[PDB]
């Protein structure tokens, strides 16, 4: 066993601490923008389908189909086709921040579907009861919907974070950063055990930790 331990600690303490530093920035900076813009988009997906807060069939149809398309498209193909656009905004095609721009665009449409689904499960009566007492539309959505779906958003951001972690690993090979840019080096070329077992073990523990944090907080608020 000492052969596994010694190999891992000496060489890989220099590289693992860089690879974890690149994976947390790639995911953290992307999730924040996806939660901040997906909320707004998911609200518009909903009000324009309510008959009460607002109604506009054409806008609802357009937004719904655009969201479906951008959610069904292969993320890897979009990133490799978006390299010039990513290189104009970031200024460089390679790096965690560059992979972070494409991840945020894919999460933005990814989270706009979950928020709308959470808002669709709020009972219809609680909206009619709030319209009964002359509650303005901007006061219905703020005091009723976003307070009733409170326990449903936290689980939603738990699933987005697990999703943008899997996408980050794929990005590491086309562009840069992550345990994905480490795994190709010791797997696709020079297949090497010891290190691959460590990469597999670390991911399981980190996935369990984020899931445990999400469920506990969601249960508290509910």
């Amino acid at each position: 066993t000492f052969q596994q331990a010694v190999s891992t600690i000496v060489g890989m303490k220099d590289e693992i601490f860089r690879a974890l530093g690149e994976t947390f920035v790639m995911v953290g900076l992307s999730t924040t923008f996806a939660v901040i813009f997906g909320t707004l988009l998911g609200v518009l997906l909903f009000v324009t389908s309510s008959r009460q807060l607002h109604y506009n069939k054409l806008v609802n149809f357009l937004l719904d189909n655009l969201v479906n398309l951008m959610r069904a498209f292969p993320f890897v193909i979009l990133m490799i086709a978006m390299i010039p656009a990513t290189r104009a905004i970031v200024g460089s095609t390679i790096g965690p921040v560059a992979a972070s721009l494409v991840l945020s665009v894919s999460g933005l449409f990814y989270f706009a579907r979950l928020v709308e689904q959470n808002l669709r499960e709020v009972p219809k009566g609680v909206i009619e009861a709030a319209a009964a007492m002359g509650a303005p539309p901007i006061a219905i959505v703020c005091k009723v919907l976003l307070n009733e779906a409170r326990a449903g958003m936290v689980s939603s951001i738990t699933v987005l974070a697990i999703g943008l972690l899997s996408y980050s690993a794929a990005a590491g090979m086309i562009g840069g950063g992550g345990l994905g840019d480490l795994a190709i080096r010791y797997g696709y070329y020079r297949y090497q055990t010891e290190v691959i077992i460590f990469i597999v073990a670390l991911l399981v523990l980190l996935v369990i930790l984020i899931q445990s944090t999400g469920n506990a907080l969601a249960r508290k608020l509910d």
């Binding site: 009861a129 319209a131 009964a132 007492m133 002359g134 009733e148």
Partner: protein, 242 residues
């Protein structure tokens, strides 16, 4: 409170549980308890929405307490809706706020001072005898207690009308007798002119002053239940009474 005339025909592809109503006129008097009666499909629930004008009629005029509601702009209507208290068959009460907060919710929309909102709510819990469960949450209360909170949130803005969408349909006879006595006390002390939908004649024999019998979306007759005995001249009327 008068309907000059009204109607509504639901277009298909809406598949609403509601049924269409036809050219009807009604005059609920000051202080009166007036009951809408009929089998499912009679359209009593549709007729009730048209009064608060949530459902907008196809044609005709709705005069509530002086104002003509149909011609009003949305900002002014938001005051007309506040003037009318409402209660529902399904409790329709927010679950993430405490018993006190639910009663306070209409008062906060009315831009009331917060010290005043505190005074009225303790008084409202006082009336429905649920002051003790002020801090409990609506997932901990029984069916009867949830209805007695709904009546308190309806009386909080000091309304001049209440509408009641068959509140006791889900309740057993032992709790049903204790919530109907609350609507009697509210009418006797405050003159709230409550209107009521139901599918059963038995509740009318307990509560109403007059009643309207609804068949296929039109009134057949307006009976008087004050005498404590419903009497119907028509044939359809005498079938519903049985």
């Amino acid at each position: 409170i008068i309907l000059d005339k009204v109607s509504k025909h639901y277009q298909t592809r809406d598949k609403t549980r509601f049924a269409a109503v036809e050219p009807t006129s009604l005059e609920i008097r000051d202080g009166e308890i007036f009951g809408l009666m009929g089998y499912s499909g009679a359209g009593k629930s549709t007729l009730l929405r048209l009064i608060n004008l949530l459902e907008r009629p196809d044609s005709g005029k709705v005069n509530v307490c002086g104002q003509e509601l149909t011609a009003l702009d949305a900002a002014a209507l938001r005051q007309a809706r506040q003037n009318i208290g409402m209660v529902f068959q399904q409790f329709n009460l927010l679950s993430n706020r405490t018993v006190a907060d639910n009663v306070a919710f209409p008062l906060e929309i009315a831009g009331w001072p917060s010290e005043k909102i505190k005074a009225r709510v303790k008084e409202c819990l006082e009336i429905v005898g649920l002051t003790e469960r002020a801090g409990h949450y609506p997932a901990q209360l029984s069916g009867g207690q949830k209805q007695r909170v709904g009546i308190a949130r309806a009386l909080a803005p000091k309304p001049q009308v209440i509408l009641a969408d068959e509140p006791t349909s889900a309740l057993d006879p032992a709790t049903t007798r204790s919530v109907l006595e609350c609507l009697e006390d509210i009418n006797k002390r405050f003159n709230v002119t409550i209107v009521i939908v139901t599918h059963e004649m038995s509740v009318i024999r307990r509560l109403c002053d007059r009643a309207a019998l609804l068949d296929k979306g039109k009134v057949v007759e307006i009976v008087e239940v004050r005498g404590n005995q419903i009497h119907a001249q028509s044939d359809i009327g005498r079938e519903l009474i049985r």
